[PDB]
Point group: none
């Protein structure tokens, strides 16, 4: 008799007068006997994320965003962590 | 009889008057007898992240973002940690 | 009888009047008898991260972002740690 048991991951409890905050980005579980395949590319506040993959192929992949671009004077802001804080100015 | 048991990772409890904050980016588990494959490329606040892979392939992969780009005078901020704090000015 | 038991990694408790903060980037677990392969490339605040891989392949991989680029006078900031604090000016 076999067993795997990946249960209860990233859970959370609370009692009394407890406060909590939780933020998650991009979990991927695999249990038992199967196959899984998930590439990921993220980009934030002006960065570039990329990811490529191939299994038993013959083809041709090629990627090139943002080619020769020219945006204008901006003022951006972003907050991703839990209970964080962010700010942005310009003159 | 065999057994694996990777349960309860990245959990969280709380009692009394206790506070918490949690941030996760990019977890990936594998348990038992299967295969898994997850490339990842991230980018932030003006950086570049890249990742490639291949298994038994024959083709050609190619990547080149941001070619000759020219942005303009900006003012960017960003906070990703728990209870972080960020600021940004321009003159 | 065999056993692996990688449980409870990166957990957290709290009682009384306790405070806590937690940040995680890029964990990876492989328990039992399986295969796993996850390359990662990260970039931040004007850097470059890259990563490549291959298993039994025949092909050609080539990477070259940021080719000949010319951004403009910027003023960025970023806080990634727990209870960090960042700031940025320009004149």
């Amino acid at each position: 008799g076999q067993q795997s048991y990946s249960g209860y991951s990233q859970s959370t409890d609370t009692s009394g007068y407890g406060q909590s905050s939780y933020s998650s980005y991009g979990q991927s579980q695999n249990t038992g006997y199967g196959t899984q395949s998930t590439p990921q590319g993220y980009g934030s506040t002006g960065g570039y994320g990329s990811s490529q993959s191939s299994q038993s192929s013959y083809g041709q992949q090629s990627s090139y965003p943002g080619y020769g671009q020219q945006p204008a004077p901006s003022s951006t802001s972003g907050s991703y962590g839990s209970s964080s804080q962010s700010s942005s100015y310009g003159q």
